[PDB]
Design a protein around this ligand. Structure first.
Ligand SMILES: OC[C@H]1O[C@H](O[C@H]2[C@H](O)[C@@H](O)[C@@H](O[C@H]3[C@H](O)[C@@H](O)[C@@H](O[C@H]4[C@H](O)[C@@H](O)[C@@H](O[C@H]5[C@H](O)[C@@H](O)[C@@H](O)O[C@@H]5CO)O[C@@H]4CO)O[C@@H]3CO)O[C@@H]2CO)[C@H](O)[C@@H](O)[C@@H]1O
Ligand SMILES: OC[C@H]1O[C@H](O[C@H]2[C@H](O)[C@@H](O)[C@@H](O[C@H]3[C@H](O)[C@@H](O)[C@@H](O)O[C@@H]3CO)O[C@@H]2CO)[C@H](O)[C@@H](O)[C@@H]1O
Ligand SMILES: OC[C@H]1O[C@H](O[C@H]2[C@H](O)[C@@H](O)[C@@H](O[C@H]3[C@H](O)[C@@H](O)[C@@H](O)O[C@@H]3CO)O[C@@H]2CO)[C@H](O)[C@@H](O)[C@@H]1O
Ligand SMILES: [Ca+2]
Ligand SMILES: [Ca+2]
Ligand SMILES: [Cl-]
Ligand SMILES: [Cl-]
Ligand SMILES: [Cl-]
Ligand SMILES: [Cl-]
Ligand SMILES: [Cl-]
Ligand SMILES: [Cl-]
Ligand SMILES: [Cl-]
Ligand SMILES: [Cl-]
Length: 646
């Protein structure tokens, strides 16, 4: 790691990078940070207020020697500028700065293209990376965040299994391949995903993550990482391209993926990690403006509330500007439809609200959700964009961990049961999630003001899969009993108010063999196992039918808390069950009333129904012995949905 020199403070009039006054002096507001390319000329602008000198170093190859070093001119508000009056396309560059007594060299933080492993900025005309027809790219319609069904997927997981039937395994283009087949001829890849009826694919880190995680020059050797180690925020990851050495390839191929998903009726959500960088000492931010872009404690050490070594200082204006302009780059250049903010509680509220505001000016249907966990940091508590402050973050969804733990049990105490597995006293936790996490009434309240702020899930890339958690918490159960519990958990997600979220492979009871944190586990742990999918085609169809049920019934997708409080009623139900009605054509539902039973009791039950008319079975008939319209006879763990028709 070596030495960080925070600068000769005579350069900044005696004002240290750590002084609050620093943020009055050097707040550059221009829209031209980075390289602005033209065949006529390329203009460079670097923000580096503490540097006493700045150079652009030009390279001809991603690994070669400098062919030219050009001094930059000190400009306004801590920036440096340089105009090169030639066609610079095909060249590579870095910045070299003198900060204090030492010289540092770094990629452009505003890099839009890079060489292999992201060690040099690539000069490229981005118009030459657009797919044929990109100008006519249109998004599938979306009337409400509550109409989304999110499918969380890793680009490598999707296709790397040897029987995936996909040619470009591990690559962006692997998800553009249509008509791919797996074991016994089952659909795989894109056709499998569109066939489920999900609406959004949420992609694990597709920005450029560090060479320490996946070495893009050694892709012929085994490799795997989720990618939560950011290196270049504004350029795609090289290992998901067919040629990481061609700066244009990863850009064109990601746009091809997005174009194809849109044409097949899918939207794309990008997992973004603005809360930390791969290495606080080696990142370009620290080489160019040490002390500014990352958060420091009072003793001038890194704040490490991410447990990754560092936090980004989103609350400082130039970093706030950086994050916002990065998001807008992904929206405008790549047509991205949403963002999932990793450790959103490490980002400040003003930054999150300005992001939401800027996106609403472009397209309010663009999704913003995040991990709103309550986590310590030097960022003051009232500024953290987390669940405790959700009242201050309108329109931003947060993962509902209360609902998650109530349904499947404590994710950190592996053997602890929850609602689905026969634990005691989880019914109110499930009810709170059914109501969308809102202040429904009495003890049924969580953090959400509106149901658009609550993302419901029982599986994601983190922690055990739902199947693996059920296994660890039900040692006395058979796999057939656990499969019923698994199906019930998925049903709860898809019939609760709010935004439903599925982990890729949940539809076929994805297992990681009990691995809790698979971020760098081999592909054998992390792949979408298309053999298991072929053995679980009935479970896949069950998930497809659940998703179809939610789409057929807008009563499950109410947009406002007032509607939920006026139409959702919890009914009398015994322990280890939850029952509710959605009354009076809620949300424009075609049926007059719905009744939903979550039955975690494996035995036989006779239940009293509210006398609202001639109930009929709509879902889960396999659990129903009799319906008297009022009394319901059920047996076995699972969901039952009844309706009173119009
Ligand atoms: O269409 C009217 C239908 O609507 C509702 O059914 C829903 C189910 O309650 C729900 O479970 C889901 O059904 C899935 C099923 O869970 C999944 O396993 C798979 O089903 C397989 C069966 O495993 C298999 O035994 C066989 O099913 C037979 C069934 O035994 C027989 O009684 C009769 O109904 O014919 C069926 C086949 O046509 O094959 C199926 C298909 O592989 O896939 C199912 C569909 O995704 O979703 C249903 C709605 O789609 C009502 O609850 C039910 O009463 C009504 O009959
Ligand atoms: O690289 C240093 C860092 O690596 C490891 O941290 C990884 C976590 O173990 C891994 O689970 C993942 O954590 C992220 C979650 O997946 C994400 O959804 C959210 O909760 O934020 C987490 C951080 O962004 O990725 C990280 C980073 O690769 C290792 O465990 C750390 O101790 C180590 O400092
Ligand atoms: O040391 C880094 C850490 O990274 C990962 O931990 C993540 C959890 O796996 C993930 O569930 C989430 O934890 C939050 C809970 O879900 C929530 O209910 C509440 O308890 O807040 C938690 C965060 O404080 O996020 C963490 C942190 O990224 C990885 O899985 C760990 O193994 C690893 O230790
Ligand atoms: Ca990379
Ligand atoms: Ca909104
Ligand atoms: Cl759908
Ligand atoms: Cl690869
Ligand atoms: Cl907090
Ligand atoms: Cl328990
Ligand atoms: Cl809560
Ligand atoms: Cl058990
Ligand atoms: Cl019976
Ligand atoms: Cl009616």
């Amino acid at each position: 790691h070596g030495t960080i020199d925070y600068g000769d403070v005579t350069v900044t009039g005696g004002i240290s990078v750590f002084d609050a006054k620093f943020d009055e002096l050097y707040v550059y507001d221009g829209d031209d940070l980075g390289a602005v390319y033209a065949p006529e000329e390329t203009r460079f602008r670097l923000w580096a207020p503490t540097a006493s000198e700045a150079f652009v170093v030009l390279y001809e190859t991603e690994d070669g020697m400098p062919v030219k070093e050009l001094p930059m001119k000190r400009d306004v508000q801590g920036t440096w500028t340089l105009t090169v009056a030639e066609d610079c396309g095909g060249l590579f560059y870095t910045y070299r700065v003198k900060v204090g007594e030492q010289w540092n060299e770094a990629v452009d933080p505003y890099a839009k293209a890079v060489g292999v492993n992201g060690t040099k900025t690539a000069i490229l005309d981005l118009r030459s990376t657009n797919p044929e027809g990109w100008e006519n790219d249109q998004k599938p319609p979306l009337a409400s965040p509550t109409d989304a069904v999110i499918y969380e997927l890793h680009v490598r997981d999707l296709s790397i299994h040897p029987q995936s039937g996909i040619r470009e395994k591990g690559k962006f283009l692997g998800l553009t391949e249509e008509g791919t087949r797996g074991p016994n001829g089952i659909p795989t890849g894109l056709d499998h995903i569109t066939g489920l009826g999900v609406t959004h694919v949420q992609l694990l880190p597709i920005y450029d993550y560090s060479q320490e995680s996946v070495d893009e020059s050694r892709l012929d050797e085994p490799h795997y990482n989720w990618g939560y180690d950011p290196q270049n925020y504004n350029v795609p990851e090289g290992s998901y391209s067919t040629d990481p050495h061609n700066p244009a390839a990863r850009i064109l191929e990601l746009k091809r993926l997005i174009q194809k998903l849109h044409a097949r009726g899918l939207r794309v959500i990008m997992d973004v990690v603005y809360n930390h960088v791969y290495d606080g000492y080696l990142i370009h931010f620290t080489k160019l403006v040490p002390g500014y872009y990352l958060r420091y404690k009072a003793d001038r050490t890194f704040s490490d509330g991410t447990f990754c070594g560092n936090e980004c200082a989103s609350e400082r204006p130039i970093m706030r500007k950086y994050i916002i302009e990065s998001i807008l780059h992904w929206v405008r250049e790549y047509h991205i439809d949403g963002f999932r903010f990793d450790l959103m509680g490490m980002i400040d509220i003003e930054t999150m609200n300005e992001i939401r505001r800027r996106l609403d000016e472009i397209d309010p249907t663009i999704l913003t959700i995040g991990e709103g966990w309550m986590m310590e940091t030097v960022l003051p508590k009232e500024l953290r964009a987390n669940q405790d402050n959700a009242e201050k973050l309108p329109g931003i969804g947060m993962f509902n961990d209360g609902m998650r733990d109530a349904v499947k049990g404590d994710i950190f105490i592996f053997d602890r049961k929850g609602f689905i597995s026969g634990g005691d006293g989880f019914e109110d936790g499930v009810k709170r999630g059914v109501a969308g996490g809102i202040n429904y009434g009495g003890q049924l309240r969580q953090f959400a003001v509106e149901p658009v702020q609550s993302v419901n899930y029982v599986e994601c890339h983190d922690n055990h899969t739902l199947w693996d958690k059920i296994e660890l918490s039900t040692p006395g159960a058979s796999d057939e009993e656990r499969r019923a519990m698994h199906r019930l958990a998925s049903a709860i997600v898809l019939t609760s108010q709010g935004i439903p979220f599925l982990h890729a492979g949940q539809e076929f009871m994805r297992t990681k063999g009990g691995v809790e944190n698979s971020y760098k586990s081999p592909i054998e742990v992390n792949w979408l196992d298309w053999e298991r999918c072929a053995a679980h085609q009935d479970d896949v169809s069950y998930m497809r039918s659940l998703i179809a049920l939610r789409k057929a019934h807008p009563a499950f997708r109410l947009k406002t808390a007032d509607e939920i409080r006026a139409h959702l009623r919890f009914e009398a139900a015994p322990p280890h069950t939850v029952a509710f009605t959605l009354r009076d054509h809620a949300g424009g539902d075609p049926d007059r009333h719905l009744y939903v039973l979550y039955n975690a009791n494996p035995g036989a039950l006779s239940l009293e129904l509210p006398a609202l008319g001639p109930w009929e079975v709509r879902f889960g008939g396999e659990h129903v012995l009799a319906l008297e319209a009022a009394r319901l006879e059920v047996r076995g763990v699972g969901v039952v949905v009844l309706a009173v028709p119009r």
